[PDB]
Amino acid sequence: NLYDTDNIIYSPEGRLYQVEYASEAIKQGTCAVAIKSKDYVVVSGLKKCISKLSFPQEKIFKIDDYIGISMSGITSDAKVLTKFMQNECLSHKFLYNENINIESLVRSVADKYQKNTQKSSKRAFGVGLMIAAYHNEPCIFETRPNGSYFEYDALSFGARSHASKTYLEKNLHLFEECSLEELILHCLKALKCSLSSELTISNTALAVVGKNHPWQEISSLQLEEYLSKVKM
Template identity: 45%
Template sequence: MFRNQYDNDVTVWSPQGRIHQIEYAMEAVKQGSATVGLKSRTHAVLVALKRAQSELAAHQKKILEVDNHVGISIAGLTADARVLCNFMRQECLNSRFVYDTPLPIARLVSLVGNKKQIPTQRYGRRPYGVGLLIAGYDEKGPHVYQTCPSASVFDCKAMSIGARSQSARTYLERRLDQFLDGQDLFLSVHFHHPIYFHEYFCACDISTVSSMHVVDLSRFPVTIFCPFLADLDDLVKHGLRALRETLPNDQDLTTKVCAASAHLGSLHLGDCCSSENGI
């Protein structure tokens, strides 16, 4: 994209009916590391690649907990995501304080869309340069939503955003029927593909939502057998495999720096994952 006379402000339309500042903000999402969201009938899972500026820096968090029943993964400007995450947490807290009930996911996503739309119509402001995948669970079941800098909101079965995310979306489109119903599955959370990120110092971040609880899979046990959690394993595996599609051909996806934990209802799935053995 090149600078032109119609991109000085977000309130200026081009003769083609485009708002260039919004398009620039959407390009910022494509520069962020990839993240994947997918759901079945009982679970919603978020998987993301984390980056560090160097070996001396810690990996940036890509998956954030909003409330007990909802979490987000981000691609784009982390600072903008932090502002939106704090807004979402405040709205969830208000719902619990006033109505003593979790905020419905559709209502929360609508509020986020409205907040992101405001700077697209006001002079002297810029759009939020971050895309969100919002995974939540309410009385209607699991949900995965996508929000864009343009303030558009999409209800998705599976989605990927960030750098090279088209490869992940292609993988999800081809295998959507394998994880959407969550049938004929078994749980053995053990991945045989090593995951190393030498060049870009990436890490893997995983989270899931089920039964009104956000699950942070950053400390997931190496192997778990539990029949009623069958489709969770399948979702995580498909999420990781889709995420692997976003990496260059000369890089592999392993669990060298990946750890996870899970809270499903009253069940707590321990915390332990060796950085050497992988998941």
């Protein structure tokens, strides 16, 4: 009512309204979905297209070899976070000649979330990141506008995420111990459930990373083949 003027004021219930509004900005963002099996973490997302003359926006981004993210929320904040993570991994590989520990990077970005939530005259980021990597194990992490992070078998962000989450928990048991092709297929079923109005090569993004498989977006021909397999 009057405890949402600033980000430094706890309500009588004891809630930061500004951080909740940043989470609301994440929830109104475009869709995304990630899945992992035993040796592969697949990421996909619906690229926003505001007009037929407009081209699809970039949804999936690459941070480092064997690490990548997906986006849902304010895009400039995602730009800042991407530059920070890219600089952190490249600096680590500079000074130490080894790949960075992924959860240390997740703690670093969560600290950057925290210091902006905490002090006044600054805002929390209106974005959540869907971090996927292979640091000797497939892994899926999450970030929120409050300083916080959790690890998932599968995840979805914004838009009609309820349909995707229902499909994922309906089929979570079969994700482990299946090949990469069926994994990509299941990720496409989850995104098609989020559509509710058709999936095409242009309007969807897809990325794969795993053991002996650096981060590489799927080509147009392979993505068209998988889309035709989903249609059949």
